């Protein structure tokens, strides 16, 4: 039982339209799993978009509206305006249980885009006289707010010790994320070549040192 | 109309217990059905109790399959759920949901809750020094690195408020028991070092205050 998958981003300009899905392990999506769209906006608010499948709660707008696609759970949004980008999730009714999806990020072109602008920064002398070193990849306003990041050592593709942090909305709805790959002191004075290299939008930004 | 305001929340250590409260607001919370939902660091959204109108009848998923207890007093018009046997995975923020006919549509505020076995620990801080003099032009960026320290929150103030010119300060992450986090600044070129750059992390459960200088 249990695996409700959602797309993970979408994006769109204001005035047009877009659908999300809500598709179930189990199989099909019917009426007696009661699809519900909650809206996460902006710091933690929660809100019933809509209810059983198809009803929009009240103060929800026109344009969110509840369907059964193709055996699954979708929501359309019409004319989508830049009050929506935010996180929408989906929870389908499984007879006692409630099961969540992972949520999709939603964008709706509000200001033109942008890109990062990574800054990297190396272990200073006093962490590496406590034999640990932390490089800090910095990355900050972008718009829209996805990012991929990845680290190399020499060349070669870290496949550990490296951790970033979720994008975060800056005050001027632009977002900010940071990376960390942390070693020993030892590797630090070992490798030759860091690299923190920023996908956002098919252009990858590279910064590296030595 | 509606206000359902969850709280009770704050920070236990494994194997504890904890009874969180919900309570209702122009709304004749009788007459709906009810949930808890919880949003969890990772930020997915995970369901914890479900509890009927006449609280007949309750459901749980099998994590918390006998360790949460959920239970409503409609004479004070609030939701009651009992965490019990804690573990760190429980740590997230909770929130209340009334069902209207079936459309979760009024949520709490919502109440964190820690499961850490940790200990106050005051960060270190670090300088995060520019390197090679690669100056890309009129700007330049330097940071601090606040590393392990429990619980959260820390503030990063630089140059003790007089510097707010587009500061940041990220999400923090949880390395192996201790939050670790950044602050970055934008001070011109030719401001730095000619002119100083202090970072100021102060550390309010251990109440700590540290003053790290950014030199080349
Ligand atoms: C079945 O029809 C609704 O109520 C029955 C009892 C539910 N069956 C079970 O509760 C249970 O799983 C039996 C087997 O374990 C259905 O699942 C269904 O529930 C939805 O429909 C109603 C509208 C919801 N109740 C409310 O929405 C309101 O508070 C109305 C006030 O009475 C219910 O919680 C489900 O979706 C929200």
């Known amino acids: 039982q249990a695996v409700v998958t959602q797309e993970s981003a979408l994006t769109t300009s204001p005035g047009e339209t877009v659908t999300l899905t809500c598709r179930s392990s189990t199989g099909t999506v019917t009426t007696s799993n009661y699809a519900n769209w909650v809206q996460e906006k902006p710091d933690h608010l929660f809100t019933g978009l809509i209810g059983?499948?198809?009803n929009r709660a009240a103060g929800v707008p026109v344009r969110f509206s509840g369907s059964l696609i193709g055996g699954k759970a979708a929501l359309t949004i019409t004319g989508a305006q830049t009050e929506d980008e935010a996180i929408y999730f989906c929870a389908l009714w499984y007879s006692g249980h409630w099961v969540f999806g992972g949520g999709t990020k939603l964008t709706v072109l509000g200001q033109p885009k942008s890109s990062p602008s990574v800054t990297l920064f190396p272990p200073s002398s006093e962490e590496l006289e406590t034999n640990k070193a932390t490089l800090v990849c910095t990355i900050t306003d972008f718009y829209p707010g996805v990012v991929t990041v990845d680290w190399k050592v020499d060349g070669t593709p870290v496949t550990q010790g490296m951790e970033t942090t979720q994008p975060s909305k800056q005050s001027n709805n632009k977002y900010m994320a940071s990376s960390y790959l942390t070693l020993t002191a030892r590797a630090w004075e070992r490798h030759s070549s860091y690299s923190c290299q920023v996908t956002h939008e098919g252009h990858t930004v590279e910064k590296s040192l030595s | 109309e509606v206000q359902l305001e969850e709280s009770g929340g704050g920070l236990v250590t494994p194997g504890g217990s904890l009874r969180l409260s919900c309570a209702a607001s122009?709304?004749?919370?009788?007459?709906?059905?009810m949930s808890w939902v919880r949003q969890t660091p990772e930020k997915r959204l995970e369901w914890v109790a479900f509890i009927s109108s006449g609280g007949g009848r309750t459901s749980y998923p099998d994590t918390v399959k006998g360790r949460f207890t959920i239970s409503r007093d409609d004479a004070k018009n609030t939701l009651y759920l009992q965490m019990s046997s804690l573990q760190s995975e429980d740590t997230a923020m909770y929130y209340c949901?009334?069902?209207?006919?079936?459309?979760?549509?009024?949520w709490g505020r919502g109440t964190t809750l820690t499961v850490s076995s940790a200990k106050t620990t005051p960060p270190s801080v670090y300088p995060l020094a520019p390197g090679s003099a690669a100056q890309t032009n009129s700007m330049v960026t330097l940071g601090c690195l606040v590393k392990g320290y429990f619980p959260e929150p820390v503030t990063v103030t630089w140059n003790s408020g007089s510097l707010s010119s587009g500061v940041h300060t990220f999400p923090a992450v949880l390395q192996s028991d201790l939050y670790t986090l950044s602050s970055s600044v934008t001070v011109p070129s030719s401001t730095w070092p000619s002119e100083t750059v202090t970072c100021n992390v102060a550390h309010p459960a251990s109440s700590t205050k540290v003053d790290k200088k950014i030199v080349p």
């Open positions: 949901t009334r069902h209207f006919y079936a459309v979760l549509d009024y």
């Open positions: 059983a499948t198809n």
């Open positions: 122009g709304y004749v919370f009788s007459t709906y059905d």
